[PDB]
Amino acid sequence: LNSINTNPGALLALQNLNSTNTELAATQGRINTGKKVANAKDNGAIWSMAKMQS
Amino acid sequence: GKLQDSLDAGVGNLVDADLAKESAKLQSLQTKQQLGVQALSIANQTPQTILSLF
């Protein structure tokens, strides 16, 4: 329980922080690009469909 | 990343000592060591009593 070498709860909080950082970066990409699908990484089928129609 | 975190947490669950118990065991062993050296001090004087016989 008590230990110096590792505290699992800090690792779990770091994992949730990285997860919210990833969702925040995705939302910021939706902000600047102006599109919910602006590149192949976001959604390949909708992106290729919009590319052919464009 | 999550898997390496869980692996390090498991190795810590195996190896880490529970220091909160170690403080108690340490101070108890210190008190027992001082009582042991002191009782050894009382033990040393037993032979000298017979000097009164001569």
Resolution of the structure, angstroms: 3.0
Q: How far is A16 from chain B (nearest CA, A)?
A: 11
Counting other chains too, the contacts that A16-25 makes at CB distance below 8 Å and 24 or more residues apart are A18/B1
Q: What is the DSSP letter of A36?
A: S
- In angstroms, the CA B30 to CA B22 distance is 12
- In angstroms, the CA A10 to CA B12 distance is 14
Q: What is the DSSP string of A38-49?
A: -STTT-HHHHHH
- In angstroms, the CA A1 to CA A34 distance is 48
Task: Please judge whether A4 and B20 are an interchain contact, meaning their C-beta atoms are less than 8 angstroms apart.
Answer: no
CA A36 and chain centroid, separation:
13
Residue A1, SS3 per DSSP: coil
B47 interfaces chain A, CB cutoff of 8 Å = no
Contact indicator for A41, A33 with CB cutoff of 8 Å? no
Q: What is the DSSP string of B1-43?
A: -HHHHHHHHHHHHHH---HHHHHHHHHHHHHHHHHHHHHHHHH
Say which amino acid occupies B25: K
Counting other chains too, the contacts that A14-20 makes at CB distance below 8 Å and 24 or more residues apart are A15/B1, A15/B2, A15/B5, A18/B1
**Count of all residues that appear for chain B in the document:** 54
- In angstroms, the CA A38 to CA B47 distance is 96
**Chain interruptions in chain A, by residue before each (C–N > 2.5 Å):** none
> Which residues from chain B sit within 8 angstroms of residue A2, using beta carbons?
18-20
- Location of structure tokens 């008190």: B31
Residue in B7, B6, B16, B24 with CA at minimum distance from that of residue A4: B16
H-type helices in chain A, by residue range? 8-33, 44-53
Technique employed here was cryo-EM
Q: What is the DSSP letter of B45?
A: T
